[PDB]
Structure 1
């Protein structure tokens, strides 16, 4: 899988389930153009965002709707959402995992980048 997103929950110690995720790619004129979207599964993961064909060198933005996740749980959190912006594939094709660990007032993100 060229690109995958995992969301964990640090308050309950569980996967973050059914979290909406939106991906954008910067167009050649400096505008954000819609690239993919989905909701996280039961194990906090979202696969099949894209293919190796269409996942070319570029700047991408991953937006995770953290606010909606917390409210659905009865919690009013701090952040409107969490976004990860990064250059991809600028040194040949890699497989990417964007992970995020969430709390109401904090979040952490990391990327796992491997050569297939």
Structure 2
């Protein structure tokens, strides 16, 4: 599992469950192509987006649909989404965890990159 996303809700102090996440990879013509997507589980984690074979070097965009998450809880949040854009695998295969922490008017995101 080379790419994992984990989402937390800073208001409720809980995993952010059933959050939609879309991954795109920049194509040869500089447009975004759809790469993978999923929803976070009961633990706020999304595993199984991709495989070592499919996750080649490239520029990736992870879009987390924070607006639908807050709306489903009855809050009108500020942001439409949280987008995280980065180059992956440039020096060889790594494992990436993209974590995000959500509040209605703020978010933070952190990447944890490791070598398994």
Q: Same fold (TM over 0.5)?
A: yes
Kindly provide the CA deviation profile for residues 27-74 of structure 1, in whole angstroms up to 9, marking residues without a partner as x: 011010000000000000000000000100000000000000001001
Aligned counterparts of 1:31 and 1:75: Cα–Cα separation in 2 = 33
Structure 1 runs, 4 residues or longer, greater than 6 Å off: none
Tell me the TM-score normalised to structure 1 length: 0.99
Aligned counterparts of 1:13 and 1:110: Cα–Cα separation in 2 = 18
Q: How many residues align?
A: 116
Offset of residue 77 of structure 1? 0.5
| 2:42 match | 42
Give unmatched runs, 5+ long, in structure 2: none
Offset of residue 101 of structure 1? 0.2
Question: What is the root-mean-square deviation of aligned Cα atoms in Å?
Answer: 0.4
Give unmatched runs, 5+ long, in structure 1: none
Offset of residue 25 of structure 1? 0.1
Residue 81 of structure 2 aligns to a residue in which SS? Answer: strand
Offset of residue 102 of structure 1? 0.5
Tell me the TM-score normalised to structure 2 length: 0.99
